[PDB]
């Protein structure tokens, strides 16, 4: 049994948009925008919804760039995260209750203030390669196992 989640990265030629998570799961870390996929919406619609709720942004087209599965030791549910990317966004990003948005130069990505797994798969994102990842966590800071591979179809 797994649960569907979304993650959205706004990636422009010289900069990537991140949000500082202000509360809840992963608070204190920069991340793409996203959340639970609801009953009654597609994964992509959920990704769009969460981008809007967390940054105020809307987008023309979302592209599937990755899938990452997470196991947390002791938790029955696997987290099945669908990672999306876009270059063209609509609007200017604004702070929400969940997220404080900020643009980062591509050589200044704040990996030490991101989920540890990002250090592994974020380069593949930047290199415009599609990927499948799996990460086993003990708590929120320690990766016990992982796999990472490029794919042709996400």
Binding residues for 8-oxo-dGTP are 6, 21, 31, 33-36, 115-118
Asked if 143 and 116 count as a contact pair (C-beta separation under 8 A), the reply is yes
Q: CB of 135: closest distance to ligand CEU in angstroms?
A: 6
Q: Which residues are documented as binding site for 8-oxo-dGMP?
A: 6, 21, 31, 115-118
Longest dimension (CA), the chain: 41
Position among 17, 18, 35, 124 found at the interface with ligand CEU (CB under 6 A): 35
Single out the residue of 119, 108, 112, 104 nearest to residue 12, CA to CA. Answer: 104
Distance CA 14, CA 104 (A): 9
**Position 70 contacts ligand CEU (CB under 6 A):** yes
Q: CB of 11: closest distance to ligand CEU in angstroms?
A: 14
Residue 42, token pair as written in the block: 């597609």
Please give the residues from 5 up to 34 whose contact with ligand CEU meets the rule CB under 6 A: 5, 7, 26, 31, 34
Distance CA 17, CA 105 (A): 9
Residues that bind ligand CEU (CB under 6 A): 5, 7, 26, 31, 34-35, 70, 81, 115, 117-118, 137
């Amino acid at each position: 049994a797994s649960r569907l989640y979304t993650l959205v990265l706004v990636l422009q030629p010289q900069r990537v948009l991140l949000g500082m998570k202000k509360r809840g799961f992963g608070a204190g870390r920069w991340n793409g925008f996203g959340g639970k996929v609801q009953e009654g919406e597609t994964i992509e619609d959920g990704a769009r919804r969460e981008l809007q709720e967390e940054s105020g942004l809307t987008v023309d087209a979302l592209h599937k760039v990755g899938q990452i599965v997470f196991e947390f030791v002791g938790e029955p549910e696997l987290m099945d995260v669908h990672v999306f990317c876009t270059d063209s966004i609509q609007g200017t990003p604004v702070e929400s209750d969940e997220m404080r948005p900020c643009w980062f130069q591509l050589d200044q990505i704040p990996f030490k203030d991101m989920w540890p797994d990002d250090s592994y798969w974020f380069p593949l994102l930047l290199q415009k390669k599609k990927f499948h990842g799996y990460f086993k966590f003990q708590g929120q800071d320690t990766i016990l196992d992982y796999t990472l591979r490029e794919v042709d179809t996400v």
